[PDB]
């Protein structure tokens, strides 16, 4: 929505694959310099959870997003 | 008062015979001539409207006409001196080399007249479409194209929608020639205005030689190929042989009797007024040709001894010889075959008389004169600045007006689509962004005074079709631009077979009597300019041919703003109408006032009209730049606006409830904020 | 009555008195009220008149900062103002229509100056709503 | 002597002080037209004569103080 200037309430998770094909059919030159991250679950559910990397990197990152985070 | 009552007896008589003409049906007629006279008289035109809408339309046409002729422009350094369009504002646009004074005259005039003609012009489109749809056209643009319509004459027909394709088909063969002329003028304008013109972009709209860029003919002193060769001028040889007022027409009458055309009518010599009189006599001095009727032809001009009025004498006599030829038709068919033929026959008389071959045989050039190939380029480039330079302007303007009448352009996109068509078709960029409060087409004479403009496109194409067809009959051997039809008889017989038709035949049938084709053609126009097109392609070997529609003369001091309303507030955020754009322009003008007071120690009264917004999108993004309060040529630099916005960013955020991630100034970043507290 | 009063004015019955208490809202950290702040106040009132005539009266009227006429500026920070039609100087918008326009956009004018309805008083216009509760 | 006043309903007709603006102020009984002619004229000429009149007081006081 920043490379083609669309309003924010039109592009969401339900039709992301619908409208990215509409952008290369409209401007094939302006769509080439844009980048699109490739990410899907089972790639974030399988990561480096090595020794001393769960209580210190995984739990302490999730505690800071709860309310009353010094208590947890 | 002697001509207003005698003028209204003619107009009241014609509406009485018009309402008698609908007594006869039109499709129960067989003879083509009596059908053509009946359709030209039965035409309702106005009067199809309600009688209170008919007086509203004439009030708009009178108001738009008096705004254009009585406009005052105020010089921001002395409000006691107002300049009015024809004396003073046309002289700045035609003579000045100051960038800041041409930019002022363009803008001011534009803006003011613009605004006025806006509401009026908007009300004018609705009333003219009602009058055209009651006469069984689809819009008012289809009503204007009814001149070129031809109905049922066995192979010579022409539709009113066929004119649109023939204009666009002929235009894409001029675009190779116009691109090389646009590239040569752009390279010559960079020496006259350095640091103002991009070498791969469009030309700025206020540097073209007049107020609208219609003719490029005032750019000749900056774009002359060889300035050390005088372009040939026979004005001194006229005042060295004591040529009176009468010699200029008597040599003009000998030109036309040389080709096989009749003499002047011998009432032509007493009744006409070839100069302004020996009295200091108030009498509109404007070249014209009159056809009063009853075989009485008079020419009214105030001729001075110059080669300029030696040429327009040949032009104005050409209107007379066209008028003397069709004087045997009935009264309602005594016009040109379409609206474009009448001026085109007048200008092929002027082209043939301006050649140095004709001037040295008419006694005005040393029999020892040498025409070099450097002076033919000087002559052809002066022709192309008037002929070729006006063809994309004429095509773009009628294309915009045709799409406005049929409704392809809604009224919230009139000035958006106007300046997109300038960059794409003409190659001309505006210096200041213009929103939907301006009306820049209506600041031209032909738009605000209700005139059709396609007659200037077709006349240019018919003019070289006539000239190329007459020079094959006169057995010419060289280039087309050296041709002269004097002493021939066979060429005049080719010309006279069209001149006597009038409107009695379809105009496509009139063209085959001269050219040999049934349609207008652009290939004779290009053959005239092939010595220039060969020389132009060698001068543009290191240049770039073409232009970019992205460059602007203001878009390097602009700042892009991006606003994310639904990220900051979400389900509770206001909607961004144009009252929010007014509050944004006042907050930026407030921030510029605080920066110049606390840093530069000056008090400058910035307003919301000094913040110029362009390219408004739905995501909510635009560009803006800041201008000094009444000096439109003074743009505050981008580095001083970034320092002013950094000083007051916390105040602009609070006026809209945004938080520096929902109000982004692209190129300005938040910097500070070191964290700590544990001692 | 022989004599005259120097207090009456032909505009001072459609005027609204504004009182601003900067040091109560912010204290040791409040900006100073120069005439650039008076320019921002006159643009915020002209914005509020534009939004009222568009959403209630369905008209678009181009009010500017030059249509808000300020009189009697004091040090405590108090003045009167009245609103005029954009080029008709004889047409004063009535006081009852400016009170309805300021009530519609009072939360927006407060945020532009960081005031909180006790530091930006329009004398004659009072805050009304706000019923409390939640325990069901 | 050369001030033009524009009628907000027709900007193409400017009235200049002695013919036209003095006749409104001396003959009219319309409240809204007398209020317009007063204000307009005032404001415009006002502004101009301001900076000039301000510079005029300083130079005239210098000439008077040099003549004791
Ligand atoms: C109707 O058409 C006929 C021919 O189609 C016209 O007839 C000519 O008329 C002129 C004088 O009126 C004669 O000199 C010609 O000899 C006629 N031609 C022929 C072939 O007979 C007739 O003029 C047309 N009607 C009108 C009113 O013009
Ligand atoms: C001129 O205007 C008249 C209307 O005043 C048009 O006419 C009518 O024609 C229809 C048939 O199509 C008749 O039923 C009406 O009676 C006519 N008018 C009336 C009511 O008197 C006419 O078509 C117009 N002519 C042109 C140039 O198109
Ligand atoms: C006018 O004609 C002369 C004569 O041919 C041209 O001069 C020639 O130019 C070419 C290209 O630069 C050279 O290769 C020749 O050697 C030149 N001839 C001589 C005799 O020196 C000249 O270029 C022409 N000018 C134009 C504008 O066409
Ligand atoms: C074209 O027409 C002119 C006008 O008649 C001719 O000019 C005459 O030329 C001869 C010799 O060149 C002179 O003796 C006459 O005095 C000229 N006449 C006039 C009126 O000036 C010219 O010769 C014609 N051209 C050709 C090729 O025949
Ligand atoms: C409007 O601004 C322009 C600058 O954008 C001023 O033009 C300058 O004029 C002075 C003297 O007149 C020249 O020395 C400068 O070189 C000019 N600047 C540029 C960039 O050309 C112009 O004077 C301003 N007009 C007013 C009335 O202040
Ligand atoms: C400016 O506003 C005044 C009202 O303050 C308008 O005066 C009214 O004019 C109409 C007709 O001209 C009368 O019927 C009303 O009675 C007038 N009102 C008052 C209070 O006297 C005036 O017309 C406005 N001017 C413009 C150009 O709109
Ligand atoms: C966004 O805009 C497009 C085009 O106007 C529309 O088709 C789509 O439904 C919109 N998305 C919404 C309303 O969520
Ligand atoms: C646009 O890109 C997609 C891949 O992202 C490709 O499949 C498609 O063919 C492209 N369209 C054009 C017109 O090149
Ligand atoms: C035209 O007039 C001249 C004299 O003015 C005369 O000699 C000539 O014969 C005339 N033309 C014709 C065709 O009679
Ligand atoms: Zn002409």
Author numbering:
A (entry chain A): 345 to 416
B (entry chain B): 60 to 738
C (entry chain D): 603 to 738
D (entry chain D): 128 to 195
Quote the passages of the study that discuss this structure, keeping the authors' original sentences:
To gain insight into the interaction between ACE2 and SARS-CoV-2, we purchased 0.2 mg of recombinantly expressed and purified RBD-mFc of SARS-CoV-2 (for simplicity, hereafter referred to as RBD; mFc, mouse Fc tag) from Sino Biological Inc., mixed it with our purified ACE2-B0AT1 complex at a stoichiometric ratio of ~1.1 to 1, and proceeded with cryo-grid preparation and imaging. In contrast to the ACE2-B0AT1 complex—which has two conformations, open and closed—only the closed state of ACE2 was observed in the dataset for the RBD-ACE2-B0AT1 ternary complex. The structure of the ternary complex was determined to an overall resolution of 2.9 Å from 527,017 selected particles. As expected, each PD accommodates one RBD. An extended loop region of the RBD spans the arch-shaped α1 helix of the ACE2-PD like a bridge. At the N terminus of α1, Gln498, Thr500, and Asn501 of the RBD form a network of H-bonds with Tyr41, Gln42, Lys353, and Arg357 from ACE2. In the middle of the bridge, Lys417 and Tyr453 of the RBD interact with Asp30 and His34 of ACE2, respectively. At the C terminus of α1, Gln474 of the RBD is H-bonded to Gln24 of ACE2, whereas Phe486 of the RBD interacts with Met82 of ACE2 through van der Waals forces. The overall interface is similar to that between SARS-CoV and ACE2 (7, 8), mediated mainly through polar interactions. Structural alignment of the RBD-ACE2-B0AT1 ternary complex with the S protein of SARS-CoV-2 suggests that two S protein trimers can simultaneously bind to an ACE2 homodimer.
